[PDB]
């Protein structure tokens, strides 16, 4: 909630509560895993208007879990999730630096709207598909003010040589273009970058660069919204073999995500959606699965302060998957006190 | 302080910075410690009126420790304490679901009510008595609207298999009844819960449940402070052997806690205090003492932001107990910036 | 920005998101590093009104990093800077404790005031020349009221025992005089303290006593500052040998610190400076460089929320140094959104 606006400057403190459990049968062969997930967010978001022509403006949050004890666990999935600082000057562009969300998350961003699960693709510290360190992005709104609804974005990421591959990525260029109208949205966004010699001395994946791609079709108006998505990569997609003790990345995947909702007066929000996640070429193994479920789920809001949901995880994933991926469903409950 | 209402919504951020320092003789065999202990907490509470008949609420609450360098040891002690979302329902009930106080602390409150120690039997993440991940509460004030100064609550607690046996848990369900009437009250509570293989592969405890329960008494009213409070408990108490290198449960303990106060005009509040915990059927040691104790204390307020205060251990451990329990006294001295 | 005022007290819960990067040859033969240097800060301030002759207050501030991954290196670098309670007294004085600056500080701060780099002397939990943990701080503004310009602080500090010589110290006492008069400033500080028999246990270093000094003189006024600091050191400055993968305390340093900035009414804010820290009589190498650079830089303020900066440090230090020191010049840029 905006808490302070004076001078010309607002900041906006804000966070939630949030009370989870998964359901599943027993975690271990699951899609969502089994038991208490409750967390916390907090951060602030700010905009101070420099002159007429000119913002400035910044933003972090960060991840409490709320599922560890108060001793030597309790840390386990804290982090920073956004930290980043920019400027946006009227007709000609926003400019930011920091930990944001890459730029192929613009197009998974369109069906990425689940209450719980959802959006399986847009990996953490994964390049360009979801939130990263050390991007620059520049963005533009409506082709410079020249044509309402056209807009793209071009983001350069800086490598991260860190002690797991997991979680490096060596440097590469990003960008995105959309246009919408009239609740009508496409989207396309592409994005590589080198590898480093830590995420090629791994068995899985072959090649010193990394690829991602994906499209998105959207609608989105009188109360409906309907999205999809399709996806490529290479050498991008990290991918575990648990039989093994194995781990890297899959030299090609191909990706499809669909969903439906509906907003209901009242506060009801029906969801049903697909994804399959396939990958191809792994050293071992050859094509397969990394995800595939059909979704039902609802939210009900309350208010803009309050909601609580439901999300049903059908997994088709099967029982004899060559790396071990769960074949049970998931279901999470989840309620929500949010400012 | 309340730093947001608008719509119908207000959100309290908040926090106090504690500088704290414990005296002991040299702090190994003390009940204390000996050193800097300093530390700040910071939290958002906050309430929605969904209705005239229903509120949404949440609140989050963590400890960043101040004693610790800003080196490798930086997180040690730094913990969230609370994380949870619920609703109220006006003569129907409240029901939150996340991390906090299990519900025999509502006896256990009565007590717990010194400037720095006391609460010595409320442990963290263990069962019902202290703050604990993953229980659904209900709780119901008046009765319903029926009957005013009656009020009760029942917790289910979902298993927490965690890689210490000290912070697991089994599933468990729990409750209290309390009755107050001119400043009176009474109160009981109980618990019991399945422990895990991991806590029973330990020496120490004997059984395949755990079980709590606690007795309150207490006068609050013309500015007299008096409490008292009863407790036992099975498999649920931990412990620890250190000559042994040797840790677990105490199969049996009985434990009581005893509190005056006074809060005078000017803002000075005396303390003094007892309290007591005795383990039994321990093996290999027998019966032998957990906590053993006169207080002398007391807290000046200036004001509703700021206080200073003093508490005094007079520990009545005994040179020779057979888990080594801290024999030496200890005070702490401190100062509170809050909001 | 203050978000709370009302009864007596005012509360300031701020932060800042700062978008950095650093550029050297390669980082690790460098001073600053190469890459992405990200991170936000956040914190409270709070100050209350007791009476006309007495206020309450206090402050937490914590370092949250934006450069690692949401993975198990998500918290490097996390910490809390700052926690201490206070009261200040009319004429009489102010007394606070917790984790607060060193009193040496109060002279190295004269010089610690380029964008990004400087201040290489004011380590951290390094006694009294940085923050540090268990401080008992008094400070007099104004001898008393009696002579306006003449301030005085004096300083305990409580030893820290710690799992590492570089974070632990031993019991010790600091002071500070300072007289400023109209632009003109100059200030002495020193402190000692007892040394533990962990840091003594280490090759470098020799002593059972730590010493640190500095005096400092600065110009500020008209829109020009300029500062210089001296100072020396025994067995204080922490320091490693990379080759004989060595550690411990340089058992004299001599320092030296100059800086100059113009500050411009559209809010370029432009800083040349230098800077020299030699350690002597070291275990096996003798008389050896830390730290020896010019810097140039400069800072754009948009307004009291938004920056942006560089910061380029040409590194004299030399391509043998006996201990390994980074021989390669870093540049930092810079964009700080702060509320
Ligand atoms: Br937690
Ligand atoms: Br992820
Ligand atoms: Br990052
Ligand atoms: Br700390
Ligand atoms: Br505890
Ligand atoms: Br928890
Ligand atoms: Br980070
Ligand atoms: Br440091
Ligand atoms: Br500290």
């Not at 079709?217 to 990569?233: C, M, P, R, S, V």
């Not at 071992?284 to 309050?306: C, H, P, Q, S």
């Amino acid at each position: 909630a905006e808490i302070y606006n004076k001078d010309g400057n607002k900041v906006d403190l804000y966070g939630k509560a949030v009370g989870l459990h998964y359901f599943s049968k027993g975690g271990e062969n699951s899609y969502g895993g089994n038991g208490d997930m409750t967390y916390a967010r907090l951060g602030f978001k700010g905009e101070t208007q420099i002159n007429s022509d000119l913002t400035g403006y910044g933003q972090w949050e960060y991840n409490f879990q709320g599922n560890n004890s108060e001793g030597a666990d309790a840390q386990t999935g804290n982090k920073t999730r956004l930290a980043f600082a920019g400027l946006k000057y009227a007709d000609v562009g926003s400019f930011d630096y920091g930990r944001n969300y890459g730029v192929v998350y613009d197009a998974l961003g369109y069906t990425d709207m689940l209450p719980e699960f959802g959006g399986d693709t847009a990996y953490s510290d994964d390049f360009f598909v979801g939130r990263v360190g050390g991007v620059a992005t520049y963005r533009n709104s409506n082709f410079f003010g020249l044509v309402d609804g056209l807009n793209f974005a071009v983001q350069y990421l800086g490598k991260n040589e860190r002690d797991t591959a997991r979680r490096s990525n060596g440097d590469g260029v990003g960008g995105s273009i959309s246009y919408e109208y009239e609740g009508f949205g496409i989207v396309g966004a592409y994005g590589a970058a080198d590898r480093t010699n830590l995420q090629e001395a791994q068995p899985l994946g072959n090649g010193k660069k990394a690829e991602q791609w994906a499209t998105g079709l959207k609608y989105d108006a009188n109360n409906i919204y309907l999205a999809a998505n399709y996806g490529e990569t290479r050498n991008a997609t990290p991918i575990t073999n648990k039989f093994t003790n194995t781990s890297g990345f899959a030299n090609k995947t191909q990706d499809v995500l669909l969903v439906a909702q509906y907003q209901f007066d009242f506060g009801l929000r029906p969801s049903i959606a697909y994804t399959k996640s396939k990958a191809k070429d792994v050293e071992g193994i050859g094509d397969v699965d990394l995800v595939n479920y059909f979704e039902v789920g609802a939210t009900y809001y309350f208010n803009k302060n309050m909601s609580t949901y439901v999300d049903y995880i059908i997994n088709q994933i099967d029982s004899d998957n060559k790396l071990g991926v769960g074949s049970d469903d998931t279901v999470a409950v989840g309620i929500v006190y949010q400012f």
